[PDB]
């Protein structure tokens, strides 16, 4: 069993999604 | 919508894999 | 002259700082 | 404060250099 593995995936997915929104609109300001 | 989107996507996945490993070690110390 | 170079640094610095706060408190939840 | 901090720092710089290059190309298309 590895809760940290699955658990870590969650938190990581939360950050990746957050960056998307930011970088998304941020990258739009240029183009 | 534009390159700005496809970009933010490449960054997220990049940041995810990065933070993904971090959390792993974070819990490793105490699981 | 390269405004994109210096300009890019700014935006990038804004994201890095943002991630710090997030990852900071996020990494604290573990330890 | 703890490893959680030193970590978030390593991630930021990592995400920065990543987003730093992106912006470069973003403006490259139109500067």
Coordinates of N, CA and C in Angstrom, one line a residue:
Chain A
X1 N 0.8 -1.2 0.0 CA 0.0 0.0 0.0 C 0.9 1.3 0.0
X2 N 0.4 2.3 -0.7 CA 1.1 3.5 -0.8 C 0.2 4.7 -0.9
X3 N -0.3 5.2 0.2 CA -1.2 6.3 0.2 C -0.5 7.6 -0.2
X4 N 0.8 7.7 0.1 CA 1.5 8.9 -0.3 C 1.6 9.0 -1.8
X5 N 1.7 7.9 -2.5 CA 1.8 7.9 -3.9 C 0.5 8.4 -4.5
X6 N -0.6 7.8 -4.2 CA -1.9 8.3 -4.7 C -2.3 9.7 -4.1
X7 N -2.0 9.9 -2.8 CA -2.3 11.1 -2.2 C -1.5 12.2 -2.8
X8 N -0.2 12.0 -3.1 CA 0.7 13.0 -3.7 C 0.2 13.4 -5.0
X9 N -0.4 12.4 -5.8 CA -0.9 12.7 -7.1 C -2.0 13.8 -7.0
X10 N -2.9 13.7 -6.0 CA -3.9 14.6 -5.8 C -3.4 16.0 -5.7
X11 N -2.6 16.3 -4.6 CA -2.1 17.6 -4.4 C -1.4 18.1 -5.6
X12 N -0.6 17.3 -6.3 CA 0.2 17.6 -7.5 C -0.8 18.1 -8.6
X13 N -1.9 17.4 -8.7 CA -2.9 17.7 -9.7 C -3.6 19.0 -9.4
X14 N -3.6 19.4 -8.1 CA -4.2 20.7 -7.7 C -3.3 21.8 -8.1
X15 N -2.0 21.6 -8.0 CA -1.1 22.6 -8.4 C -1.0 22.8 -9.9
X16 N -0.9 21.7 -10.6 CA -0.9 21.7 -12.1 C -2.1 22.4 -12.7
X17 N -3.2 22.2 -12.1 CA -4.5 22.8 -12.6 C -4.4 24.3 -12.3
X18 N -3.9 24.7 -11.1 CA -3.7 26.1 -10.7 C -2.8 26.8 -11.7
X19 N -1.7 26.2 -12.0 CA -0.7 26.8 -12.9 C -1.3 27.0 -14.3
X20 N -2.1 26.1 -14.7 CA -2.8 26.2 -16.0 C -3.5 27.5 -16.1
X21 N -4.4 27.7 -15.2 CA -5.2 28.9 -15.2 C -4.3 30.2 -15.2
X22 N -3.3 30.2 -14.3 CA -2.4 31.3 -14.3 C -1.6 31.4 -15.6
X23 N -0.8 30.5 -15.9 CA 0.0 30.5 -17.2 C -0.9 30.7 -18.4
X24 N -2.1 30.1 -18.3 CA -3.1 30.3 -19.4 C -3.3 31.8 -19.7
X25 N -3.9 32.5 -18.8 CA -4.2 33.9 -18.9 C -2.9 34.7 -19.1
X26 N -1.9 34.2 -18.4 CA -0.6 34.9 -18.4 C 0.0 34.8 -19.8
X27 N -0.1 33.7 -20.4 CA 0.5 33.5 -21.8 C -0.4 34.1 -22.8
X28 N -1.7 34.4 -22.5 CA -2.6 35.1 -23.4 C -2.3 36.6 -23.5
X29 N -1.8 37.2 -22.4 CA -1.4 38.6 -22.4 C -0.4 38.9 -23.5
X30 N 0.5 37.9 -23.8 CA 1.5 38.1 -24.8 C 0.9 37.9 -26.2
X31 N 0.2 36.9 -26.5 CA -0.5 36.6 -27.8 C -2.0 36.9 -27.7
Chain B
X1 N -7.6 27.5 -28.0 CA -7.8 29.0 -28.2 C -6.5 29.6 -28.9
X2 N -5.4 29.1 -28.5 CA -4.1 29.6 -29.1 C -2.9 28.9 -28.4
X3 N -1.7 29.2 -28.9 CA -0.5 28.7 -28.3 C -0.4 28.9 -26.8
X4 N -1.0 30.0 -26.4 CA -0.9 30.4 -25.0 C -1.5 29.2 -24.1
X5 N -2.5 28.5 -24.7 CA -3.2 27.4 -24.0 C -2.3 26.2 -24.0
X6 N -1.9 25.7 -25.2 CA -1.1 24.5 -25.3 C 0.2 24.7 -24.5
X7 N 0.6 25.9 -24.3 CA 1.8 26.2 -23.5 C 1.5 25.9 -22.0
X8 N 0.6 26.6 -21.4 CA 0.2 26.5 -20.0 C 0.0 25.0 -19.7
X9 N -0.4 24.2 -20.7 CA -0.6 22.8 -20.5 C 0.8 22.1 -20.3
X10 N 1.7 22.4 -21.1 CA 3.0 21.8 -21.1 C 3.7 22.2 -19.7
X11 N 3.4 23.4 -19.2 CA 4.0 23.8 -18.0 C 3.4 23.1 -16.8
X12 N 2.1 23.0 -16.8 CA 1.4 22.3 -15.7 C 2.0 20.9 -15.5
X13 N 1.9 20.1 -16.5 CA 2.4 18.7 -16.5 C 3.9 18.7 -16.0
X14 N 4.6 19.7 -16.4 CA 6.0 19.8 -16.0 C 6.1 20.1 -14.5
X15 N 5.3 21.1 -14.0 CA 5.3 21.4 -12.6 C 4.7 20.3 -11.8
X16 N 3.8 19.6 -12.4 CA 3.1 18.4 -11.7 C 4.1 17.4 -11.3
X17 N 4.8 16.8 -12.4 CA 5.8 15.8 -12.2 C 6.8 16.2 -11.2
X18 N 7.1 17.5 -11.2 CA 8.1 18.1 -10.2 C 7.6 18.1 -8.8
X19 N 6.4 18.6 -8.6 CA 5.8 18.6 -7.3 C 5.3 17.2 -6.8
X20 N 5.1 16.3 -7.8 CA 4.7 15.0 -7.5 C 5.7 14.2 -6.7
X21 N 7.0 14.3 -7.2 CA 8.1 13.7 -6.5 C 8.3 14.3 -5.1
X22 N 8.2 15.6 -5.1 CA 8.4 16.3 -3.8 C 7.5 15.7 -2.7
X23 N 6.2 15.7 -3.0 CA 5.3 15.2 -2.0 C 5.6 13.8 -1.6
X24 N 6.1 13.0 -2.5 CA 6.5 11.6 -2.2 C 7.5 11.6 -1.0
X25 N 8.6 12.4 -1.1 CA 9.6 12.5 -0.1 C 9.0 13.2 1.2
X26 N 8.1 14.1 1.0 CA 7.5 14.8 2.1 C 6.8 13.8 3.0
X27 N 6.1 12.9 2.4 CA 5.4 11.9 3.2 C 6.4 10.8 3.7
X28 N 7.4 10.6 2.9 CA 8.4 9.5 3.2 C 8.9 9.8 4.6
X29 N 9.2 11.0 5.0 CA 9.7 11.4 6.3 C 8.7 10.9 7.4
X30 N 7.5 11.0 7.1 CA 6.4 10.6 8.0 C 5.2 10.1 7.3
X31 N 5.0 8.8 7.3 CA 3.9 8.1 6.6 C 3.3 7.1 7.6
Chain C
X1 N 18.7 45.6 -28.2 CA 17.6 45.7 -27.1 C 16.7 44.5 -27.1
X2 N 16.3 44.1 -25.9 CA 15.4 42.9 -25.8 C 14.5 43.1 -24.6
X3 N 13.3 43.7 -24.9 CA 12.3 44.0 -23.8 C 11.7 42.7 -23.4
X4 N 11.5 41.7 -24.3 CA 10.9 40.5 -24.0 C 11.7 39.7 -23.0
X5 N 13.1 39.8 -23.1 CA 14.0 39.2 -22.2 C 13.8 39.7 -20.8
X6 N 13.9 41.0 -20.6 CA 13.7 41.6 -19.3 C 12.2 41.5 -18.9
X7 N 11.3 41.7 -19.8 CA 9.9 41.7 -19.5 C 9.5 40.2 -19.1
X8 N 10.0 39.3 -19.8 CA 9.7 37.9 -19.5 C 10.1 37.5 -18.1
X9 N 11.3 38.0 -17.7 CA 11.8 37.8 -16.4 C 10.8 38.2 -15.3
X10 N 10.1 39.3 -15.5 CA 9.2 39.9 -14.6 C 8.0 38.9 -14.4
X11 N 7.3 38.6 -15.5 CA 6.2 37.7 -15.4 C 6.6 36.4 -14.8
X12 N 7.7 35.8 -15.2 CA 8.2 34.6 -14.7 C 8.4 34.7 -13.2
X13 N 8.9 35.8 -12.7 CA 9.2 36.0 -11.3 C 7.9 36.1 -10.5
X14 N 6.8 36.5 -11.2 CA 5.5 36.6 -10.6 C 4.9 35.2 -10.3
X15 N 5.2 34.3 -11.3 CA 4.7 32.9 -11.2 C 5.5 32.1 -10.1
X16 N 6.8 32.3 -10.2 CA 7.7 31.6 -9.2 C 7.3 32.0 -7.8
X17 N 7.1 33.2 -7.6 CA 6.7 33.7 -6.2 C 5.4 33.1 -5.8
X18 N 4.4 33.0 -6.8 CA 3.1 32.5 -6.5 C 3.2 31.0 -6.1
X19 N 4.0 30.3 -6.9 CA 4.2 28.8 -6.6 C 4.8 28.6 -5.2
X20 N 5.7 29.5 -4.9 CA 6.4 29.4 -3.5 C 5.3 29.4 -2.5
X21 N 4.4 30.4 -2.4 CA 3.4 30.5 -1.4 C 2.6 29.2 -1.4
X22 N 2.1 28.8 -2.6 CA 1.3 27.6 -2.7 C 2.1 26.4 -2.2
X23 N 3.1 26.0 -3.0 CA 3.9 24.9 -2.6 C 4.4 24.9 -1.2
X24 N 4.7 26.2 -0.7 CA 5.1 26.4 0.7 C 4.1 25.8 1.6
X25 N 2.9 26.4 1.7 CA 1.9 25.9 2.6 C 1.5 24.5 2.2
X26 N 1.5 24.1 1.0 CA 1.2 22.8 0.5 C 2.1 21.8 1.0
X27 N 3.4 22.1 1.0 CA 4.5 21.2 1.5 C 4.5 21.1 3.0
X28 N 3.9 22.1 3.6 CA 3.8 22.2 5.1 C 2.7 21.2 5.6
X29 N 1.7 21.0 4.8 CA 0.6 20.1 5.2 C 1.1 18.7 5.5
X30 N 2.2 18.3 4.7 CA 2.8 17.0 4.9 C 3.6 16.9 6.1
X31 N 4.6 17.9 6.2 CA 5.5 17.9 7.4 C 5.1 19.0 8.3
Chain D
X1 N 12.1 27.5 8.0 CA 11.0 26.9 8.9 C 11.1 25.3 8.8
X2 N 11.4 24.8 7.6 CA 11.4 23.4 7.5 C 11.7 23.0 6.0
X3 N 11.9 21.7 5.7 CA 12.1 21.2 4.4 C 11.0 21.7 3.4
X4 N 9.8 21.9 3.9 CA 8.7 22.3 3.1 C 9.0 23.6 2.4
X5 N 9.8 24.5 3.1 CA 10.2 25.8 2.6 C 11.3 25.6 1.5
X6 N 12.4 25.0 1.9 CA 13.5 24.8 1.0 C 13.0 24.1 -0.3
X7 N 12.0 23.3 -0.2 CA 11.4 22.6 -1.3 C 10.7 23.6 -2.3
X8 N 9.7 24.3 -1.8 CA 8.9 25.2 -2.5 C 9.8 26.2 -3.3
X9 N 11.0 26.4 -2.7 CA 12.0 27.3 -3.3 C 12.6 26.6 -4.6
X10 N 12.9 25.3 -4.5 CA 13.5 24.6 -5.6 C 12.5 24.5 -6.7
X11 N 11.2 24.4 -6.4 CA 10.2 24.3 -7.4 C 10.0 25.6 -8.1
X12 N 9.9 26.7 -7.4 CA 9.7 28.0 -8.0 C 10.8 28.3 -9.0
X13 N 12.0 28.2 -8.7 CA 13.1 28.4 -9.6 C 13.0 27.5 -10.8
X14 N 12.5 26.3 -10.5 CA 12.3 25.3 -11.6 C 11.2 25.8 -12.5
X15 N 10.1 26.2 -12.0 CA 8.9 26.7 -12.7 C 9.3 28.0 -13.4
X16 N 10.1 28.8 -12.8 CA 10.5 30.1 -13.3 C 11.2 29.9 -14.7
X17 N 12.3 29.2 -14.6 CA 13.2 28.9 -15.8 C 12.3 28.3 -16.9
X18 N 11.3 27.6 -16.5 CA 10.4 26.9 -17.5 C 9.5 28.0 -18.1
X19 N 8.9 28.8 -17.3 CA 8.0 29.8 -17.8 C 8.8 31.0 -18.4
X20 N 10.0 31.1 -18.0 CA 10.9 32.2 -18.5 C 11.1 32.0 -20.0
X21 N 11.4 30.8 -20.4 CA 11.7 30.5 -21.8 C 10.4 30.7 -22.6
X22 N 9.3 30.2 -22.1 CA 8.0 30.3 -22.7 C 7.7 31.7 -23.2
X23 N 7.7 32.6 -22.2 CA 7.4 34.0 -22.5 C 8.3 34.5 -23.6
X24 N 9.5 34.1 -23.6 CA 10.5 34.5 -24.7 C 9.9 34.2 -26.1
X25 N 9.4 33.0 -26.3 CA 8.8 32.6 -27.5 C 7.5 33.3 -27.7
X26 N 6.7 33.5 -26.7 CA 5.5 34.2 -26.7 C 5.6 35.6 -27.4
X27 N 6.6 36.3 -27.0 CA 6.9 37.6 -27.5 C 7.5 37.6 -28.9
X28 N 8.3 36.5 -29.1 CA 9.0 36.3 -30.3 C 8.1 36.4 -31.5
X29 N 6.9 35.8 -31.3 CA 5.9 35.8 -32.4 C 5.5 37.2 -32.7
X30 N 5.5 38.1 -31.7 CA 5.1 39.4 -31.9 C 5.8 40.4 -30.9
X31 N 6.8 41.0 -31.3 CA 7.6 41.9 -30.5 C 7.8 43.3 -31.2

